[PDB]
Scaffold this active site. Sequence first.
Site, short mmCIF file in Angstrom:
data_model
loop_
_atom_site.label_atom_id
_atom_site.label_comp_id
_atom_site.label_asym_id
_atom_site.label_seq_id
_atom_site.Cartn_x
_atom_site.Cartn_y
_atom_site.Cartn_z
N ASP A 1 6.79 -4.23 -0.57
CA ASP A 1 6.38 -4.17 0.89
C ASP A 1 5.88 -5.66 1.09
O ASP A 1 4.73 -5.91 0.98
CB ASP A 1 5.67 -3.13 1.17
CG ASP A 1 5.09 -3.27 2.71
OD1 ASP A 1 5.65 -4.33 3.26
OD2 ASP A 1 5.19 -2.20 3.34
N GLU B 1 -6.82 -1.11 -0.01
CA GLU B 1 -5.57 -0.70 1.02
C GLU B 1 -5.54 0.79 0.83
O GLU B 1 -4.66 1.67 0.53
CB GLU B 1 -4.37 -1.26 0.52
CG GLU B 1 -3.06 -0.92 1.39
CD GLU B 1 -1.88 -0.41 0.82
OE1 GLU B 1 -1.47 -0.94 -0.28
OE2 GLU B 1 -1.41 0.56 1.07
N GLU C 1 -3.85 11.03 2.97
CA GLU C 1 -4.41 10.78 1.60
C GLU C 1 -5.86 10.57 1.45
O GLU C 1 -6.59 10.65 0.59
CB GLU C 1 -3.59 9.44 1.19
CG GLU C 1 -1.96 9.54 0.83
CD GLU C 1 -1.54 8.22 0.20
OE1 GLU C 1 -2.11 7.68 -0.69
OE2 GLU C 1 -0.69 7.65 0.85
N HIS D 1 6.51 -0.08 4.63
CA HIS D 1 6.80 1.17 3.91
C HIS D 1 5.94 2.12 4.57
O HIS D 1 6.23 3.35 4.38
CB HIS D 1 6.48 1.04 2.36
CG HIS D 1 4.84 0.93 2.25
ND1 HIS D 1 4.08 -0.01 2.22
CD2 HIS D 1 3.95 2.17 2.14
CE1 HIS D 1 2.81 0.37 2.20
NE2 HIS D 1 2.87 1.71 1.93
N1 LIG Z 1 1.25 5.32 1.91
N2 LIG Z 1 0.41 4.21 1.46
N3 LIG Z 1 -0.06 3.02 0.70
C1 LIG Z 1 -1.58 3.43 0.15
C2 LIG Z 1 -1.62 2.77 -1.30
C3 LIG Z 1 -2.83 3.21 -2.06
N4 LIG Z 1 -3.00 2.69 -3.47
C4 LIG Z 1 -3.30 1.11 -3.23
C5 LIG Z 1 -2.73 0.33 -4.60
C6 LIG Z 1 -3.33 -1.17 -4.60
N5 LIG Z 1 -3.86 -1.51 -3.50
C7 LIG Z 1 -2.21 -2.09 -4.93
O1 LIG Z 1 -1.65 -2.21 -3.83
O2 LIG Z 1 -2.30 -2.09 -5.92
C8 LIG Z 1 -4.27 3.53 -3.66
C9 LIG Z 1 -4.67 3.42 -5.03
O3 LIG Z 1 -5.94 3.76 -5.26
C10 LIG Z 1 -6.25 4.88 -6.28
N6 LIG Z 1 -7.01 5.69 -5.59
C11 LIG Z 1 -7.03 6.55 -4.68
N7 LIG Z 1 -8.25 7.16 -4.54
C12 LIG Z 1 -9.20 6.80 -5.30
C13 LIG Z 1 -10.39 7.13 -5.73
N8 LIG Z 1 -11.14 8.07 -4.77
N9 LIG Z 1 -10.99 6.26 -6.52
C14 LIG Z 1 -10.40 5.29 -7.51
N10 LIG Z 1 -9.04 5.06 -7.08
C15 LIG Z 1 -8.29 5.91 -6.20
C16 LIG Z 1 -4.89 5.29 -6.30
O4 LIG Z 1 -4.62 5.94 -7.58
C17 LIG Z 1 -3.81 4.08 -6.03
O5 LIG Z 1 -3.44 3.46 -7.38
#
Ligand SMILES: [N-]=[N+]=NCCCN(CC[C@H](N)C(=O)O)C[C@H]1O[C@@H](n2cnc3c(N)ncnc32)[C@H](O)[C@@H]1O
Lengths: 343, 343, 343, 343
Positions: C31, C123, C132, C280
């Site tokens: 994205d 993010e 989420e 996305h």
């Molecule tokens: N729709 N949409 N987009 C939303 C995409 C979100 N994603 C972002 C990934 C990163 N910014 C990147 O671009 O590299 C969230 C990540 O955080 C993790 N994550 C979730 N909650 C927890 C938690 N409480 N403690 C530790 N980690 C956590 C998840 O496992 C994911 O890997």
Amino acid sequence: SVFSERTEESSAVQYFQFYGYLSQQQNMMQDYVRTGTYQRAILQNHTDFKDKIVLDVGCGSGILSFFAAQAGARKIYAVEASTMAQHAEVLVKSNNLTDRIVVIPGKVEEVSLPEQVDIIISEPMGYMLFNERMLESYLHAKKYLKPSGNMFPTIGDVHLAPFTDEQLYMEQFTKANFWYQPSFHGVDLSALRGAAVDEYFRQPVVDTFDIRILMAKSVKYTVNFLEAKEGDLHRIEIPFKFHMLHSGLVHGLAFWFDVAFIGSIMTVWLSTAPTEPLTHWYQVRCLFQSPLFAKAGDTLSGTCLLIANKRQSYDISIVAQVDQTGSKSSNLLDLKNPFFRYT
Amino acid sequence: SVFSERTEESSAVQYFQFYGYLSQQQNMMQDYVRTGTYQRAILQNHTDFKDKIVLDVGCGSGILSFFAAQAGARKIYAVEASTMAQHAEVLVKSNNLTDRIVVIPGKVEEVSLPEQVDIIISEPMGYMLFNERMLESYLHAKKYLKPSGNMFPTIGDVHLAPFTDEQLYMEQFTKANFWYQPSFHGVDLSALRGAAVDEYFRQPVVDTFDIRILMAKSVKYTVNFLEAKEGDLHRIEIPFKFHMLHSGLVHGLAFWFDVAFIGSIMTVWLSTAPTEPLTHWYQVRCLFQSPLFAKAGDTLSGTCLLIANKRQSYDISIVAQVDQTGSKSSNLLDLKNPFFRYT
Amino acid sequence: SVFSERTEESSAVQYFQFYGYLSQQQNMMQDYVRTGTYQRAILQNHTDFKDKIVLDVGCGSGILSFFAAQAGARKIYAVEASTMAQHAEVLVKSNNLTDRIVVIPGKVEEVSLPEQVDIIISEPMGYMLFNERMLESYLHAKKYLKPSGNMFPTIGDVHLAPFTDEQLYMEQFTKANFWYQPSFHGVDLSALRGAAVDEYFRQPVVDTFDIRILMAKSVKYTVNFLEAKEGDLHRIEIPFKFHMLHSGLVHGLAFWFDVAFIGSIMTVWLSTAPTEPLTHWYQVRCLFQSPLFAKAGDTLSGTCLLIANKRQSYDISIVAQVDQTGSKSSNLLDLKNPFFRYT
Amino acid sequence: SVFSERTEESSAVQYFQFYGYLSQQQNMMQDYVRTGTYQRAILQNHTDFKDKIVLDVGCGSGILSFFAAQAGARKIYAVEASTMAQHAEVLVKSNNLTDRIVVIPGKVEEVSLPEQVDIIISEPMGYMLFNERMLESYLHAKKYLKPSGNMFPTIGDVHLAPFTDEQLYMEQFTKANFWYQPSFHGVDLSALRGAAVDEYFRQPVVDTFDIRILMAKSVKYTVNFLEAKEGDLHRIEIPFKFHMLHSGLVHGLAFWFDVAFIGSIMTVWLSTAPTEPLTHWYQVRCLFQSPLFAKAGDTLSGTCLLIANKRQSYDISIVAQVDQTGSKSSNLLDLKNPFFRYT
Ligand SMILES: [N-]=[N+]=NCCCN(CC[C@H](N)C(=O)O)C[C@H]1O[C@@H](n2cnc3c(N)ncnc32)[C@H](O)[C@@H]1O
Ligand SMILES: [N-]=[N+]=NCCCN(CC[C@H](N)C(=O)O)C[C@H]1O[C@@H](n2cnc3c(N)ncnc32)[C@H](O)[C@@H]1O
Ligand SMILES: [N-]=[N+]=NCCCN(CC[C@H](N)C(=O)O)C[C@H]1O[C@@H](n2cnc3c(N)ncnc32)[C@H](O)[C@@H]1O
Ligand SMILES: [N-]=[N+]=NCCCN(CC[C@H](N)C(=O)O)C[C@H]1O[C@@H](n2cnc3c(N)ncnc32)[C@H](O)[C@@H]1O
Ligand code: NA
């Protein structure tokens, strides 16, 4: 009954069959101007309804009764002659209003009400206000109205104005001249051309138009529903004197109407004028057999006479003359069979 | 009278008022396929008319009587119940045929004719052929027919075929969905959602369509006007078994008809099929409230049942099922109240 | 822990399983608007990172930590709960940033950090912003933030606007109409018609659309991440009052969101509005089971209520009414089960 | 219970949540091949059902039970573990079959049934036949089956065949090579390229394909549900020896399945082969890590080993060698997380 005496059974059957269809009720309900203006008239005058006894003449689906209930009415008698009555009863139940709204199937001229009412509501207007002759049922219902009573709508204004429309006028002959040919598949039809012309000109034209075709300020004929009696609507004489604003050929008279809801808090108007948003009533035009030439400043004087018939409509007699020239025109129209021209 | 016993007065008055207008006669006459084919049928079988006595049932303007006169008929009795009878007389005089065409005003079931006739002509076909129930007047008129007599048209074929059309189905459902609202201006209408769907889906859809929506070869039901009796038309049962040529959703049944004029010289066909030039009959479609899925090779079986009512029409019950799955659809239609979808 | 108490393990397993796949990380990284805007937000505000201690909540592949490293951060604690944490560590080594990026495996609500941080990056935005429930982890992480520290993103705006889209509405109703069949393979399903409509209409529609379907200027709901507490996101009540710009049927509400990175040097915006390049996240629409008619100038008022559930999502309650008519619609939606409508 | 011991709860929750949706039931019901074939097998073998006791394992909406009722079953026990059971109960009432169909909410391994049954019906097939592991519930239910009882379906055949598809094989690397770049926004991602490749190759591909990609007659592995034990499905060893019909590169194995209903009157087959009309099972392809070159007439021999796991799925181990060349390739796949590639 007063109704059966003024109406051919044949006409009545068709009339109440028409209003028995949910699609027709829907047609009327989806006229936002109409429904919204009734709702506003009722709700913005809540003091005319709150804890009052109400009669709804010809409730159809029952929408006006529900508006009266929203405004706080204690009791609403909803009278309805078509089979729609059974559907209205279903909605009263599903909206939990059986203790306040009582649906009475039948003609308002034939049913019995248990008490007198404080206010009567109805939507009795047809084309040119008077078509369908439901205003007489509305006025008849006043036998149940307390001396203190009110009517919603309270007054109705019919507006008349001369118009010029060369293409509308010419269309009639274009259509009738079908009969002016000496060999349609070997048959000479021309002998019926005159009758075909007369027939087309006997039809009021239902549609809307640009206000620029109007050649003088409209004239107004007012019916006060609080004072009027049934008999007043059997013969309606509308004199007119138009002062021409434009020079040209007058091809006929345009008709529309306003009604006013005169409540304790405010007066609310419902208009079908060509200067206003369009409604399912459109406007009505009646053509002259012979157009009349008028100069700006000239006076066009005469009479529109409406005579009620037993087909729940009116015979229309229009006579007009230009005072400065003596030029004269007539027409006889049958409001029951209009030409719906709107596309 | 046979007519008054099978017909509501309200229906008859309205019915004959409708055909009393010259504009309607003009509409019918200007269907060139119709008028031209009738003329062709009559003139190309001129020997069936030459020096014969003719009965024209429901002559209207009288066009068919004029065609019979052109073909050499000795005498034509033209029966017509509406006021059009007086216009037909005017044309008979202005066309100098007073010695050959005799207009007899009234219903064919009520008039008395001076002699028996060699041939009967009429145009009794309505929507779906049977609407208006004029075929019964036509068959009734056979009491005036010589044992060796003929009838023009001689036979009628009804054609049925399954179709697929999501847009039509959705167009109707969209209209019905109005009654689904839980708060139309604060009113809950949903209790009438079922009644609304039923009503909208009781409307036959009159219009034309592309033949590619048809999902199987059509089925034929034939009525022979020379042998059939009046009573045969009170209950018309049309069985069908379609062998599906395409897979998909069957949204309903399409209807059209052919009539044949079987003369001595040649047989002439008048068709309202969607493969033929359009006529004022268009075609008729009956929608299912729930479409049926069928695969190519499957069999779609059932019956279309027409029950005559006193409003000069039929109540139609259509039952269809996919034989391989038992998926079944029943439907009720009111042929008296069609949806004219042509713009 | 705060996470386990608000989350069903069943949901959490699937959730962190999802983000365990390199294909999903790839999908998110590609994205370009998202990734590019984040990099731009961080690098153009390089002074907010230079020689600072940084916490990256949910680092996934670690991309944001690398942006923070590029901007001169002294130390970045990258917390990640899925197995992706081991892949991020591989990238830290192969990019020789072991002295600046430290991967802390585990949930941000459960791990221990050696020091307080100057800035938090993440993010955490899902569909409709709040899906989420990661915003709560993000806000929870503020226990590690120095009193004057900053957050990237700093604020989030939810935008709401009414739309008209007959096609979408009828598509969903068409799908639900399956359960209306009275004889599916000989089985009557109609008793489940109500349940089917409810289920289908409980689905938010994820996709993009032309801005011309919007019937009023959008309403704004702002969350300030510097000030907000976790608990504030358990019940989110969003009142709205729209001034209708067009007349028509409102089929529902459209949702999108903006986030702003408010740095020392400049403010950078990330938008998912339909007027902006597609991301996305697309946009989200919630349908009314029954559309509402409104005229231009009318006011459409109500509330959008989001209730956090134990499946890391929200239950959505939308109540809207046309103030002038009382026309009302209530609806319930399950943000966890969206309908992805795409090519 | 046997179910709880072989299933991690998280998987079970998600699994029965999935089948709790009417839309998913609809998805399955709208598969005409599946539903029609079941209906046909049951009805064409009416002597196997009339006045018999029937057990329906995992009835979902209950459609198969209704088919059993159509065929004359005296009593049907319909066991269903998801919330769909409440919907099935509604349909039983509305179809007036409460006296014949008894809905039992719960897992077939956990509920208690009062009597032994004459026949068991179910639709337990997933992708590659065995996915979802519902066949074990089906076989478990035989504890309620009379010794002379029948099973519908009676046997299931899984088909394996070698395929060539350069595009698919290459697609995997094209996707994985995203990670093979030294500066994705300034980050070197290349160290993860290997892990990304591994991940993609662990995913079975769900979709359909042209039969021209098949390079040999399929090999068949048959499960006789009447003879088989539950335990037989924990480890499925499918040896294969393909006689190559075409020369080329074999990129992997294609999978589909048949089931047969062996009744007293006739045997009915349900096939998901690529030579047959498409079903909602599509077909499944598993890639080799390294393609194998094979000449026409050569033999490709090896084994496909399926090992049941606690996520209601299977780990797939495929080993193949060309006997004439000694060229060898393997792969290990996770059937729980397939890649849906179709259109
Ligand atoms: N729709 N949409 N987009 C939303 C995409 C979100 N994603 C972002 C990934 C990163 N910014 C990147 O671009 O590299 C969230 C990540 O955080 C993790 N994550 C979730 N909650 C927890 C938690 N409480 N403690 C530790 N980690 C956590 C998840 O496992 C994911 O890997
Ligand atoms: N053009 N236009 N609109 C014309 C208005 C149509 N309609 C309004 C329906 C409803 N109030 C609404 O506003 O939605 C009039 C109804 O009155 C009934 N009705 C007619 N006369 C009688 C009678 N004498 N006794 C009882 N009932 C009668 C008819 O059957 C109709 O249903
Ligand atoms: N759609 N379409 N077309 C349907 C045909 C319309 N129409 C045919 C007109 C004529 N052929 C022409 O085209 O000139 C029927 C006419 O028969 C009359 N008529 C009906 N029943 C009777 C009756 N029992 N006894 C006397 N006359 C009757 C009606 O009044 C009509 O005038
Ligand atoms: N097609 N397809 N996919 C696979 C079939 C999906 N489905 C078929 C639905 C219905 N028969 C129809 O034909 O319409 C299986 C159902 O069985 C249930 N089910 C699964 N295991 C158990 C269990 N151990 N005990 C009780 N019930 C169970 C599930 O909850 C499902 O509802
Ligand atoms: Na024939």
